[PDB]
Design a protein around this ligand. Structure first.
Ligand code: HM5
Ligand code: CO
Ligand code: CO
Ligand code: CO
Ligand code: K
Length: 304
């Protein structure tokens, strides 16, 4: 395999971390290939669930807990810390909150969260590589509690970073917030991509096309599929009660992506950097509720 940039996987990975049996597990948790029958039982369907009061309270809770766990990871970002150390803390934080770390064994994903450094677009596997000064790293968190999944992610700076990194991360967050600002009943899901690409393109960046936002609730990934690029064929119209994510991945160079031999790590084909931000949203009558919002601060960690 010909790597696209300077990053390389750092094996071996510590033995799989166990989750106490008292924590409720999703269906794929114990599947040999990590397959989700409940999810596949809807694969291909474009119909979108309309959550009930019970579902909404369930989503508000797991999403709040997921934010708490991302904040734990955020406090560990610094030169010298390995992504595996971050994952360990995330794993323990999920357990402490009586939640199962959704990524664990999801289609056999080996860890409890995704850590994506520099050219890694998404799904980076926490490993033995120490974070280096100047790196940017995204931590994507998803928790499962009482049958519901809560999903969010942020890109962080490791020590001081160059202007290019600052601009990429800042623009990516702005893309996310502009998209969220347009969410309300009646808006087509395909519209978000137009908003995102417009801003990314205006700043000299490209939008990843292989991965999209997604519905989430009793399932980790389900309808609707939400592309982040312009003129897409996304199917569906927003309605009060819908819950989904917007998680744009923006790149310094081209948008082309490819996967590492591990079957998960997605990287830019040109080896340039990529950043991402994500929130789980609940469409309301007046717009939308950002279920994964930070509660003790009006801004994401990178502007600190
Ligand atoms: C079923 C699947 C793994 C092929 C899939 O559609 N998957 C998907 C789509 C869009 C975004 N994200 C994912 C995903 O898995 N994300 C993960 N995060 C942590 C472990 S697996
Ligand atoms: Co994912
Ligand atoms: Co996510
Ligand atoms: Co997501
Ligand atoms: K990255």
């Amino acid at each position: 395999y010909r790597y696209t940039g300077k990053l390389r996987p750092h094996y071996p990975l510590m033995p799989t971390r166990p989750v106490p049996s008292y924590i409720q597990r999703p269906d794929y948790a114990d599947h040999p290939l990590g397959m989700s029958e409940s999810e596949q039982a809807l694969k291909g369907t474009s119909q979108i669930k309309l959550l009930s009061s019970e579902d909404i309270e369930g989503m508000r809770l797991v999403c709040r807990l997921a934010r708490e766990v991302l904040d734990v990871a955020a406090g560990m970002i610094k030169p010298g810390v390995t992504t595996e150390e971050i994952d360990h803390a995330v794993h323990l934080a999920c357990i402490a909150r009586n939640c199962y770390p959704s990524p664990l064994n999801y289609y056999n994903f080996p860890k409890s969260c995704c850590t994506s450094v520099n050219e890694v677009i998404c799904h980076g596997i926490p490993d033995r590589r120490p974070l280096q000064e100047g790196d940017i790293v995204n931590v994507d968190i998803t928790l499962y509690r009482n049958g519901y999944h809560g999903d969010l992610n942020e890109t962080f700076f490791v020590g001081e970073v160059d202007d290019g990194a600052r601009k990429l991360v800042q623009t990516t967050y702005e893309c996310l917030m502009q998209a969220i600002d347009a969410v309300k009943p009646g808006v087509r899901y395909r519209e978000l991509g137009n908003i995102i690409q417009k801003h990314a393109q205006a700043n000299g960046f490209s939008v990843v096309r292989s991965y999209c936002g997604h519905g989430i609730h009793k399932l980790f990934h389900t309808a609707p599929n939400v592309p982040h690029y312009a003129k897409n064929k996304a199917v569906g119209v927003m309605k009060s009660g819908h819950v989904f994510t917007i998680e744009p991945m923006i790149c310094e160079g081209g948008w082309q992506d490819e996967t590492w031999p591990d079957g998960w790590t997605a990287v830019t084909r040109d080896g340039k950097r990529s950043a991402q931000f994500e929130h789980t949203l609940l469409v309301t009558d007046t717009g939308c509720e950002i279920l994964t919002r930070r509660l003790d601060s009006a801004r994401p960690h990178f502007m600190s």
